[PDB]
Amino acid sequence: MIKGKQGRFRQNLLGKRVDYSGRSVITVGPYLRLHQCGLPKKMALELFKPFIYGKLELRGLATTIKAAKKMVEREEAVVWDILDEVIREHPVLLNRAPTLHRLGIQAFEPVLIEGKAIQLHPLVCAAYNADFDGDQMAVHVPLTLEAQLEARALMMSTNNILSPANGEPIIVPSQDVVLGLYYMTRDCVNAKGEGMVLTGPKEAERLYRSGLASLHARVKVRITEYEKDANGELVAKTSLKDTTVGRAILWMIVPKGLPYSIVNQALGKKAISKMLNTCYRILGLKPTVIFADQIMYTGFAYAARSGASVGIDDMVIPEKKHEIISEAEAEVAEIQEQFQSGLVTAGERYNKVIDIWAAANDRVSKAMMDNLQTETVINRDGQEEKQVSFNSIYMMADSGARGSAAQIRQLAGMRGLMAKPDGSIIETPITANFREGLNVLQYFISTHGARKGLADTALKTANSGYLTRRLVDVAQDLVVTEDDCGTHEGIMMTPVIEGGDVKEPLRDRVLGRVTAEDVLKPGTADILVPRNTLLHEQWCDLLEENSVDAVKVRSVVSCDTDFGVCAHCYGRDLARGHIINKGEAIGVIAAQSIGEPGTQLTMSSIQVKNKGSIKLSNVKSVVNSSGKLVITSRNTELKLIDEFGRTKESYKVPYGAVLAKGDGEQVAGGETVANWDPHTMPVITEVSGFVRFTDMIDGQTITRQTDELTGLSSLV
Amino acid sequence: VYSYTEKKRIRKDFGKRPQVLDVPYLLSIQLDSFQKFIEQDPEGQYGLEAAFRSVFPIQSYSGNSELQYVSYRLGEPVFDVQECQIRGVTYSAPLRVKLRLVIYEREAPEGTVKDIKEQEVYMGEIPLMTDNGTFVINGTERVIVSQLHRSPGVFFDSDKGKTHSSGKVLYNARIIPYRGSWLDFEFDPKDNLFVRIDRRRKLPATIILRALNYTTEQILDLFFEKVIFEIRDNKLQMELVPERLRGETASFDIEANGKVYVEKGRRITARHIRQLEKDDVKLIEVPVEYIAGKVVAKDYIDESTGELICAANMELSLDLLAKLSQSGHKRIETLFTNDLDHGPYISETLRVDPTNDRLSALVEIYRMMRPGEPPTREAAESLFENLFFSEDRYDLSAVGRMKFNRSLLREEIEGSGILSKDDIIDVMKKLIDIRNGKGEVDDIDHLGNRRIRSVGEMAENQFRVGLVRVERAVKERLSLGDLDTLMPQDMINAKPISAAVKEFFGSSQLSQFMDQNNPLSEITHKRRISALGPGGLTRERAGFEVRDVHPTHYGRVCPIETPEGPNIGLINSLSVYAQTNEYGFLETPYRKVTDGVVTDEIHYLSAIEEGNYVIAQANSNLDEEGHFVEDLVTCRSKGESSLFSRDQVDYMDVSTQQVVSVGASLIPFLEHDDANRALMGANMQRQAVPTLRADKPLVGTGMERAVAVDSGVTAVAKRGGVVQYVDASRIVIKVNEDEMYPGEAGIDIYNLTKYTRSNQNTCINQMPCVSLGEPVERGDVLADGPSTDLGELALGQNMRVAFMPWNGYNFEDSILVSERVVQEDRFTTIHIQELACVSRDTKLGPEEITADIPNVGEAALSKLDESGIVYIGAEVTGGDILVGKVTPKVKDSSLRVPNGVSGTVIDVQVFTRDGVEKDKRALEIEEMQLKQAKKDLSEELQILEAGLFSRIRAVLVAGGVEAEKLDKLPRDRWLELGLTDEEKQNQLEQLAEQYDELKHEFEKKLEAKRRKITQGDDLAPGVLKIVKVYLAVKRRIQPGDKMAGRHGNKGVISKINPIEDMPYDENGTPVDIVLNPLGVPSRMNIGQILETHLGMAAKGIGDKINAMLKQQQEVAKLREFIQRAYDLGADVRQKVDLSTFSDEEVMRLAENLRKGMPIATPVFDGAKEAEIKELLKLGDLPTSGQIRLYDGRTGEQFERPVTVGYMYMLKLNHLVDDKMHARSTGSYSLVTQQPLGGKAQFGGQRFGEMEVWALEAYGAAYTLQEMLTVKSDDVNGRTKMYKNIVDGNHQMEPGMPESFNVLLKEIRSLGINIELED
Ligand SMILES: [Zn+2]
């Protein structure tokens, strides 16, 4: 009774089924708002039977419950009024089957829609990562008013705009509306509405809709901004700005607080993402919601206006592809003949062949990208000018709506080199391109690769699910229970350099976290910030411009909370602005966030670039015979103290490396000081003197091996 | 030349490579398998005779009484197809087996059998295959797929990498019989060989080798070679062969005849070996120390003692050398063991042995088989012998024996079925060679290592299992073999084989309920291959590699056809030109190539055969001769491709289409699209559904014809001629006299398949497509089936299409459709629902079917009949009663329509358990079907008589021809008319016995079918009668439905929208459909664009044709324009002319083309872009094809003119109403008070534990608690929630859900003090 699957724990405390629940395939209905959702009328009818019965007996249309059931199943006239009344304020939960991250369940306000499919808001689909392939989402209904409060207050889209994994808005527009917005803030040199002046955006829209002017053209227009530099006070200024017609038209949708420089760019997916980020970070939540709604609507409308299309002619194959392929064929034939001549080996032959093929492919990529990006060459109102191209494919790629450089490379040019099921890269690349036909063999090999990818995706899905299960079940217990452990002890956080470019800055790693020790600027004897205060974006930027390099910050591991964690040890609750609140557990969300991308995962010498002074760590060196500096410490690392003073570059120095300079000295940007011989372990000597055979027995311990090249042998 | 029917609608085509060979018969494999299975072929050879002679002769041991088999036969099946479907029984025929039983006397073995007998005894009943290769098990259609299993034989694998985490590559061998115990041989990281059987406990290999009765000395002789040392008065001079010196270092001065050949410490170079060979130096003088390392081979014995001087397999030293020297044995033999050349694996393999006598090895085997039993000498001996040397429990098929010999570099292909000692010896020899480098492992995924079966194979195996079972029974009963008082029907039993075969066909991973919704669906499913099933790797534990495709599948298994998700690469389909090798392997065609002429003849090649040869690529340039104009040409030789000389290949690919399977061969412009979406679409083609009307897919591939003709959904013309009667019911064909046979001439009747149930609850029906008195050609369509169009497969529908973002309504794949598309209902589809009700007999009376039901509204009863069953044609709805069923008590249990589904009753079928009466409607329906059957018999007899008597009249045109006398008297006596002494009178007499036979056969068939209809068909026990009802629902379209094209372009439909909101061109025509452009770049396919331009151009041509038809533009201008259209550019295959065409055909074909110009395009030999631009230039449409569009809402042009054209969308079988489902308050499960699940039972959505974690992720507490508690238990909680909600209150008393109390008191029952706390 207690053990096994039939055991009561595993029998009835597990994924169950739920009444007052529904499911169907989903659609868009963009005219809806993110604070609201669609729901087919029939689903509303069956879902809320007791509710409708209660309102019915309240109105006394049929006193007994059986008669009310008969009325509703008959679908009589008055029932729809009752349905609207109950749906007046009664949010519901929408859900997807693979519930990876917590936005996969979400609260929304239904609206009664005809048909047989659920209209779902566009942007939230990206949070649901649910394409409209036919995904069947489910629906649940809270019962108690407390549950309604929870949903409307916690699971509400308005309350769920940023990711828990990190602070980026999860409501970033995905693929289509971004094309429209990119179409807005892009200039054609000469068209209608080029070369005049406007008093405001309103007449800009008027002239655009008139067709008297183009959607975009460099034009000075007076615009006004409302800045909050003061202590939470608006200051309204105005001035002329050069801009595209579409850009000025877009300016209206911006709320008062934001400036204009933010919109004065090409508005890529990252650019618009930081636009939302600024809007939330400065103007809070509701203005962001309204701004995003209007962004959706206007961008859809003007993408429809765009007539953004795609055609065979819209893809261009540079003629140099023929020439480049001819050169590559000649080169590979030459190298194969050289192998036949015996100069080189089969392995070396193959390696050089693949190298030259890759180089030719890179040449083709550069040629086609040049052919694509600036193809628009036209009169300027004068003779001729070349601008960024208005071909649909480059607009798509550069806008970041979908795809990347690699896919457009596949579309226009050769699709590179395919590997085999063994994983070894194949000697013969895919000489052809998709726009032209692909031979039997190239398609066959590409199918090997694609099927390998598909099976790997399935296996990765299963493994990610299992690993996520492990991560959640290990971390089910942990919860926030105390505000502050009152601990002075925390971790140290610094930027990260693997031995090249800095990969993650200090601003990102430190944001939203309460410092453990105060910040000591190098105006030393300066308490730059207090000792136990949260670090949000303004403070982080203060630190960044102050050039703070290493900061001691509070961490959960250092928390001294008995049976829980201290809030100050945890810092900001991402997906929310304020510091984390009491009681709110974090282990489950942490595990779930780290596990969500489990599907998205995969299954000599140095030339210093920057200019700065030389610093060394784990330093133990000596001047060699030649006068250069060699290092007598294996764990030595070189830092390039920048002009400001921070370590912008860090590289691991092997033993006995060759240094043209030394510590505490200046090195020009782009000067080779870091160099060495990675092979062979040196026996460099600390001191100088006669080298006697102290404990060297010849013929028993060592052997005299003679070199056949020079004559000067060496004891072995 | 082209057929009249084919000339009805000539499809334009693009293609340069000539069609050297056509598409073969697509459904060949199943027909081959079954026809080979069932035939009275001599000498067995993979037939029922093979199984019989395998099980026969039979006789009880020393019983002097032998049952021998004579022959087997199969009469007609008890039923035919349609009545079998209606009744619901198997479609099977008996198995009448002539057996001869003969018994001798005592001490007369060779003496004549004292008694003989023979009889055609009954042995089971076997299902029969359909003409479409299918079967019918119980009113249901299913397909038996073939499994791509491992070829039986011997194989070798590495098992490297992670094995032991040492980096030491292992080497394993596996002999796998076609039928028998597995056998495996395995090394270990200690370089010690081992063996295991059936994955049992590991054992040393050599233990079984000595168990084969081979001595240790014999074993070492087999696995080593002798090295001799001679006592030449001192130092044990050695016989040296130079070949035993490579890769060695001389620890002493190798010298002879006073000459030094290798100094001590100098390694033996090839120069030293050559010095020794030329000097011919064999005997040398070795030091004693060099012999110490050596290992003695045999056992020496002293003459005086006779005792063991030294055991075999023992290292030597000076003491042992002296001990054998005192005996004076001049011969000291060791074995040449080298670390590099011959690792001494056998030595320590022997040293690990537990014992030496064969008896102990047999004892070890006996213990190992069934551990925990006493070791018995004789039982163990018989066990070992029959385990691998008896047909009873071990054998190798011809394929197994063939490949075993082949792998072993042998010369004979046919051999014993059981193993032999030398077989295992040589397998071990190969294993040790591979361990030493020579030879290699066998890549399992390579097809030649694999094998494919066919239905006959497994069916015969089951027959063999049943045969051995009944043989056990027969021998048991013959142990009491009496003196001829019995015949061989007391010996026999009918249950075993019939039970085995029917059970196997019913429940099996190979017999699958067929996917019957679309000609493509069924043909593909039949042309399917799997890796699952018995002897088939499990889905979850399958290796990633076997999922991955191996290069040798080129042409043999389509890489692009296999379902995605739960499993991939295990159910890969069958390539188009692939056939089955005689030995169960995959033969593929090729075009032979001579010195310089590509021989157009066909030559078949096997998998391993390809590797040896090098073959020319498909898209090869040849000029009027097969002469490859390019001296350098890409060809593939051994799993790789590169450019080779003009004359190095002797074979050449048959056609571009070979590379894919049927499921992928229908995708236009595949070459321009990624494999991922290609495979996705190709799968999606499987699940398409027909609409009400076919739409002649504009961008054809040429494969539609082959699939159409092979897929027997249509009424194909067995012979040419003319149709004399045309009707929806049936068709009458008067075959041409030359085509007609002299005897049994008659005329043919084709029976159309009407509206009837599918296997996906869809509709299926055939419709005539030819007018009366119309010429018809042999082997050609007469009446299209579902989704077939004049004998061409029309899956979905082609519509005007455009790519642009329309108000964000096409966000991800949300397809946009105008109300126009639904207005003509062209997407509309039909579905059939078969609701069944049974009448069993329970306690307290049987289940009645009366109309009388207590407490039901008369309105519900109004639509019912006198008995209590609905009338056909009732527009019923969800909830209404169909058949009035009541459980005596009395209580109402009447069947009803499912909730939420409407429909219209099409038919009611009624069957009754034999021995109970029938109600008024059941009797009426019985009589109606009786009348229908009698009508059918009467009309076929009448028309056949009319044909026969018209033949009589034709005969009497001569030979006493009479005009007034013939028509004066009636057709009763037309032979009485005069005729001279001719064979015609006898021929007329023959027609008279034909007439009499018609009368008598009509009478007998009438009686037989009368009885068959009247008799109560056998039903499952308990039921008195079962009634099925068929409901038709015409579902058109709504938002949420799913449809796609032919590029994997998945898409649900956003919102049916007005014609007036849609954009339209300058001439005003709006766009039917609008799709998302952004599917193009990310989902790397572009062929949709190319075909879209192509379809736009074809439709423009068709529109011009239709315009010039509406205007009277008599055939001259039409003929010229059509001529211009068909030639159209570069080298092509059409090469048609209009001078040959019959202006009637010209106008008829133009009419057929007024709706569009169908275009054919092979997989890779299709048209080029400029050719599409060429056709566009022929059309009035822009060369780019991007047309300016005008918005309905705003009313002006869209800047950046838009790509528009025509796409062939398909309606997928995922209708939103089907996927729609919810529940508020239904029934609870019996085991637990939780909502049920699914749609068939009114369940609720399943809340998963990850959803629980997500709820936990949010701070929402009450929600999770109530959801898992009251929305999935507490009596107060749910009751009070009902009170709150009906009262209008929205509030909960959470309390505590009594399950906690259940657990608490369960623990309390245990000696556990568990309690709450403050
Ligand atoms: Zn703490």
Q: Check CB contact under 8 Å for A434 and B679.
A: no
Round to whole Å and give the CA distance between A367 and A510. 42
Residue B117's φ and ψ, nearest 5 degrees, are -165, 160
Q: Do B617 and A175 touch (CB under 8 A)?
A: no
Nearest CA in chain A to B634: A441
The CA-to-CA distance between both ends of chain A, in Å, stands at 76
Q: Please give the angle made by the CA atoms of B689, B693 and B694, to the nearest 5 degrees.
A: 75
Rounded CA Rg of chain A:
33
Cα torsion angle, A366, A369, A373, A377, sign: positive
SS3 A26: strand
> In terms of Cα–Cα distance, which of B772, B568, B1052, B1186 is closest to A136?
B1052
Residue B77 CB partners (closer than 8 Å, separation 6+): B84, B91, B92, B93, B128
Q: Supply B746's token pair.
A: 């008659």
Beta carbons of A704 and A698 less than 8 angstroms apart: yes
The edge-to-edge listing of strands for the beta sheet with B141-144 is B135-136, B141-144, B511-513
Helices (H), B1075-1153: 1079-1082, 1087-1110, 1115-1127, 1143-1153
Q: Could you tell me if B86 and B909 are in contact, meaning their C-beta atoms sit under 8 angstroms apart? A: yes
Q: Which residues contact A538 (CB under 8 A, 6 or more apart)?
A: none
Q: Which of B1165, B1200, B1204, B1280 to mutate to test the interface with A (most CBs of A within 10 A)?
A: B1200
- Nearest partner of B1136 among B9, B1, B4, judged by Cα: B1
Residue partners of B306: CB distance under 8 A and separation at least 6: none
Q: In 3D, which of B600, B650, B596, B598 has the Cα closest to residue B626?
A: B598
> DSSP string spanning B939-975?
HHHHHHHHHHHHHHHHHTTSSS--SHHHHHS-TT-SS
Residues B1081, A406: Cα–Cα separation, whole Å: 11
Q: What is the A564 CA–ligand 1 centroid distance (Å)? A: 9
Strand spans (E) along A52-123: 92-95, 105-108, 110-113, 118-119
What's the rounded Cα separation, in Å, for the pair A649 and A669? 11
Q: How many Cβ atoms from other residues are within 10 Å of residue B778's Cβ?
A: 14
Q: What are the start-end ranges of the E strands in A404-521?
A: 480-482, 491-493, 496-497, 502-504, 513-514, 519-520
What is the token pair recorded at B477? 């009963």
- The Cα of B669 is separated from the nearest Cα of chain A by a number of Å equal to 9
Instruction: Return the closest-CA partner of residue A158 out of A245, A40, A284.
Output: A284
Distances (CA, A) of B454 to A291, B461, B585: 65, 11, 11
Element (H, E) at B463: helix B455-479
Kindly state the tokens that stand for B463. 């027959």
List A243's β-bridge partners, or say none: A219
Give me the half-sphere count of Cα atoms (radius 13 Å) on the Cβ side of residue B52.
24
Of A163, A129, A185, the residue nearest A594 (C-alpha): A163
User: Using CA atoms, how far apart are residues B1070 and B1192, in angstroms rounded to an integer?
Assistant: 9
B777: which residues sit within 8 A by CB, 6+ positions away? B3, B4, B5, B6, B717, B720
CA distance linking residue B1266 with residue B1278, whole number of Å:
10
User: Dihedral through CA B659, CA B665, CA B669, CA B672, nearest 10?
Assistant: -40
Q: Do B1219 and A25 touch (CB under 8 A)?
A: yes
Greatest C-alpha distance within chain A: 117
Query: CA of B606, closest CA in chain A: separation in Å?
Result: 20
Which amino acid, one-letter code, is at A663?
A: D
A664: phi > 0 → left, psi -120 to 50 → alpha, else beta; which? left
- Whole-angstrom CA distances from B10 to B1, B59, B777, B792, B1084 are 12, 67, 16, 11, 33
Contact B261, B279 (CB under 8 A): yes
CB of B992 within 8 Å of any CB in chain A?
no
Decide: helix, strand or coil at residue A61.
coil
Residue whose C-alpha is closest to residue B1048's, from B684, B732, B1293? B684
Q: Which residues surround ligand 1, an ion (CB under 5 A)?
A: A 485, 487, 559-561, 566, 569
CA–CA separation, B338 and B1211 (whole Å) = 70
- The answer to whether the CB atoms of B1262 and A150 lie below 8 A apart is yes
Solved by what technique?
Answer: cryo-EM
- Are B1245 and A148 in contact (CB < 8 Å)? no
Distance of CA B915 to the CA centre of its chain: 42
- As a whole number of angstroms, the distance between CA A706 and CA B692 comes to 93
> What gap in Å lies between CA B1156 and CA A437, rounded to an integer?
26
Helix (H, G, I), strand (E, B) or coil at A46: helix
Q: After which residues is chain B broken (C to N over 2.5 A)?
A: 889, 1272
Q: B1258 in contact with A at a CB cutoff of 8 Å?
A: yes
DSSP string, B165-206: GS-----EEEEE-SEE--EEEE--TTS--EEESTT-S-EEHH
CB under 8 Å to B446, separation ≥6 — which residues?
A: B550, B552, B607
Residue whose C-alpha is closest to residue A392's, from A298, A316, A319: A316
Q: Mapped to the 3 state alphabet, what secondary structure does B91-131 carry?
A: CEEEEEEEEEEEECCCCCCCCCCCEEEEEEEEEEEEECCCC
Spatial CB neighbours of A106, under 8 Å, sequence gap ≥ 6: A93, A94, A95, A124, A127, A128, A155, A157, A160
In whole angstroms, give the CA distance from residue B995 to residue B948: 8
Sign of the torsion formed by the C-alpha atoms of A48, A53, A58 and A60: positive
Tell me the two tokens of residue B38: 């069932």
**Structure-token match 């694509």, residue found:** A372
Residue type, A170: I
- The whole-angstrom distance between A480's CA and the closest CA on chain B is 12
Partner residue facing A49 (CB), from B1202, B1225, B1306: B1225
Choose the closest CB to B1082 out of A150, A299, A403.
A403
CA distances from A308 to A343, A406, A550, B1117 (A): 56, 22, 49, 40
For ligand 1, the distance from its centroid to the CA atom of residue A586, given in whole angstroms, is: 14
Query: Looking at beta carbons, which residues of chain A come within 8 Å of B1287?
Result: 54
Between the CA atoms of A355, A357, A358 and A362, what dihedral angle is there, to the nearest 10 degrees?
Answer: 130
Q: φ and ψ at B1113, to 5 degrees?
A: -125, 55
Distance CA A215, CA B199 (A): 75
d(CA B932, CA B1108): 49
User: What distance separates the 2 farthest-apart alpha carbons in chain B?
Assistant: 130
B676 phi and psi angles, rounded to 5 deg: -60, -65
Peptide bond into B24 cis (omega under 30): no
What is the DSSP secondary structure assignment for residue A190, as one 8-state letter?
Answer: S
Q: Cα of A689 to ligand 1 centre, how many Å?
A: 59
Q: Which residue of chain A comes nearest to B1201, CA vs CA? A: A307
Q: How far apart are CA B112 and CA B109, in angstroms?
A: 8
Among A203, A190, A172, A198, residue whose Cα is nearest residue A267: A172
Q: What is the DSSP letter of B640?
A: -
Distance from CA of A489 to the nearest CA of B (A): 29
Contact list in B for residue A401 (CB cut-off 8 A) is: 1078
Task: Please confirm whether the linkage preceding B1201 is cis (ω < 30° from 0).
Answer: no
Which residue in the set A8, A53, A65 is minimally distant from B1303, CB to CB? A8
Beta bridge partners of B178: none
> In this structure, what DSSP letter does residue B1197 have?
B
The size of chain B, in residues, is: 1318
> Which residues does B684 contact at the CB level (< 8 Å), separation at least 6?
B1044, B1048, B1050, B1210, B1212
Residues 6+ apart with CB under 8 A from B358: B210, B211, B212, B213
| In contact, B641 and B634? CB cutoff 8 Å | yes
DSSP, collapsed to helix, strand or coil, labels residue A441 as: helix
Q: Tokens standing for A177? A: 């509306």
Verify whether the Cβ–Cβ distance A51 to B1285 is below 8 Å: yes
Helix (H) or strand (E) holding A617: strand A612-617
CA distance readout (Å), B234 to B228, B229, B287, B715:
14, 11, 9, 98
Cα within 13 Å of Cα(B1153), Cβ side:
31
Annotated binding-site residue numbers of A: 131, 133, 135, 485, 559, 566, 569
Q: What is the resolution of this structure in A?
A: 4.7
Cβ burial of B126 (10 Å; 0-12, 13-18, 19+) is buried
Alpha carbon A503 to chain centroid distance?
14
Using a CB-CB distance cutoff of 8 angstroms, which residues of chain B are in contact with residue A12? 1232, 1234, 1299
Give dist(CA B1162, CA B1166) in Å, integer: 5
> Would strands B259-262 and B781-784 be described as parallel, antiparallel, or unpaired?
unpaired
User: Shortest CB distance from A150 goes to which of B559, B1260, B1303?
Assistant: B1260
Looking at chain A, how many residues does it have? 716
Instruction: Say how far apart CA B1053 and CA B1062 lie, in whole Å.
Output: 15
The rounded distance, in Å, linking the Cα atoms of B1073 and B1094 is 17
Q: How far is B1117 from B1123, CA to CA, in rounded Å?
A: 10
DSSP B847: P
Give all strands (DSSP E) within A152-275, no chain letters.
197-198, 219-227, 235-243
> Beta strands B1023-1035 and B12-13: pairing type?
unpaired
Give DSSP secondary structure letters for B43-58.
Answer: T-SSSHHHHHHHH-SE
Could you tell me the two tokens for B258?
């006073």
Q: Are A574 and A601 in contact (CB under 8 A)?
A: no
Residue among B136, B750, B794, B234 at smallest CA distance from B520:
B794
Min distance A127 CA to chain B CA atoms (Å): 14
Nearest partner of B595 among B632, B541, B648, B664, judged by Cα: B648
Torsion angle in degrees (nearest 10) through CA of A337, A341, A343, A345: 70
Count of Cβ atoms closer than 10 Å to residue A423 Cβ: 7
Question: Burial level of A445, CB count in 10 A (0-12/13-18/19+)?
Answer: buried
- As annotated, the binding site of A for Zn(2+) includes 485, 559, 566, 569
Tokens of B1221: 């489902």
